[PDB]
Every structure is written in C-alpha cells, then in structure tokens.
C-alpha cells in the first residue's frame with residue numbers, strides 16, 4: 318500500500334460512519350503527472366481507536382480491492398498510519414446508492430435500475446472469474462460516479478466499494494443485524510464465507526435497488542431475523558417486481574444452487 322504523509326491530508330466534514338469507522342471528506346496535496354502539484358478530493362476512512370485491534374482486517378478489505386484493476390471497483394489512493402489507521406480512497410461525487418435511491422426514488426425507472434444491476438453484475442463477474450470474495454455487497458457499498466443523462470443518452474455509472482471489516486471476525490450481534498445481506502450459511506458459521514455469499518448478497522442488493530432505498534427486514538429485530546432464516550422465508554417482492562424472480566433465485570438457501578454471474582448477466586440482458 319502506498320504510504321501518504323499525514324502532512325499532505327486535510328480532514329474536512331464528516332460524512333457518516335461505517336462498522337467501527339468514521340468517514341470524512343478531505344483533500345490530498347500531491348505531485349501528479351508531469352510534476353504538477355494537485356489538490357485532490359479524497360474519501361478518508363478512519364478506524365476507531367477503541368477498535369484498533371481490527372486494523373489488519375480493516376486494511377485487508379481495502380487490499381482486496383487494490384490487487385485487481387477494474388473500471389467498476391473503487392480506487393484506493395493509499396494508507397496513512399500517528400495513532401490513526403486511515404484509508405485514503407477516491408472521492409465519488411454522488412455518494413452511496415442507498416441514499417441516492419431514497420432521495421431520487423420518484424424518478425428512477427426500470428431502465429436505470431437495469432443498467433445499475435448490469436454494471437454491478439459485471440463487477441461481481443470480474444471478481445468471480447478471479448475467485449476473489451467481496452463479502453459485503455450492499456447498496457451502501459455502491460457508489461454513483463455519474464448520474465444518468467437522458468439528454469445525451471449517458472447511462473449512470475457505478476463502482477463497488479470495499480467490504481469493510483470482514484464478517485469472519487465481526488461480533489455475532491453485528492452479523493445478525495446484517496441479515497438478510499449475510500447469507501444463512503454465514504450466520505450458521507461466518508467461516509463459510511465463499512463465492513456464493515456474494516451471489517446471495519447481490520440478490521439482497523437488487524431488492525434494495527428495487528425498493529427505493531428501503532432496508533429489507535428492518536422492522537425485525539435480530540432474534541426475528543434469525544427466525545426468518547430458520548423458517549426459510551424469502552424476501553417479499555418489491556412493488557416494482559421486475560427483478561423479483563432474479564432476487565429469489567440469487568437468495569437460494571442452498572449455496573451450490575445460486576446461479577453464476579454469467580447466468581445472472583444473461584437474465585438481466587434477457588429482461
């Protein structure tokens with residue numbers, strides 16, 4: 318990981334929090350191409366001091382995104398390691414997709430959703446061909462690089478962000494709170510993290526995209542989410558149910574039966 322000096326980073330407004338992290342918008346001063354000095358907007362993820370013992374995992378997540386280069390994967394600029402574990406990533410202009418769906422719900426049609434789903438499925442297919450597990454696919458980890466422009470025909474463009482601290486080391490209560498993004502076999506055993514995990518979570522993310530930013534099973538507490546998995550329930554079809562069958566096919570309780578992302582892309586194109 319490229320090391321960035323603390324002196325070259327300026328922390329600005331807080332954007333929110335992740336699991337054991339605080340997120341800030343900021344600015345990196347750098348020497349760019351041709352030796353020109355640049356002031357670049359950056360996203361700064363700060364691991365909580367109280368959870369410093371997660372540092373390794375906290376960085377390993379980011380590491381998984383930087384071992385491969387792809388147009389749909391977020392760029393990591395580097396790491397700043399005083400008493401702070403700081404990850405420096407690219408700043409995406411329009412933020413995460415859950416909030417965007419919530420705010421622009423009344424003007425998102427099936428074509429926009431289909432384009433976003435195809436791009437996410439392409440990123441996940443790239444990961445699958447490389448046998449690289451993401452482990453936390455959700456709308457909050459999808460970032461909107463640019464908006465759809467029907468005046469020029471430009472589609473929206475999205476990127477997948479890093480998964481954050483892995484579910485293989487997170488406390489059990491946080492894992493149960495993450496139902497139904499966390500597949501049943503990982504609730505049974507978090508070490509069952511596998512490529513099929515991402516297919517299940519991709520189905521859940523499609524539910525999110527079709528539900529205008531609503532969170533599935535948010536009305537259920539952790540015990541009731543556990544029991545939801547115990548009774549082998551499926552998520553209800555969204556009011557916009559164009560992708561409901563694909564959602565249910567991806568969220569198969571048998572991990573070996575979840576369709577490959579090539580078949581998922583074939584379904585999306587068939588629609």
Ligand SMILES: NS(=O)(=O)c1ccc(Nc2nc(OCC3CCCCC3)c3nc[nH]c3n2)cc1
Nearest residue numbers: 332333334340360406407408409410411412413
């Ligand atoms: N709604 S908003 O207008 O205030 C706005 C917000 C965030 C961003 N940019 C942005 N966000 C990320 O996480 C998105 C998320 C992080 C914390 C909770 C809020 C947003 C990124 N992850 C890598 N790069 C990222 N860039 C642009 C605009």
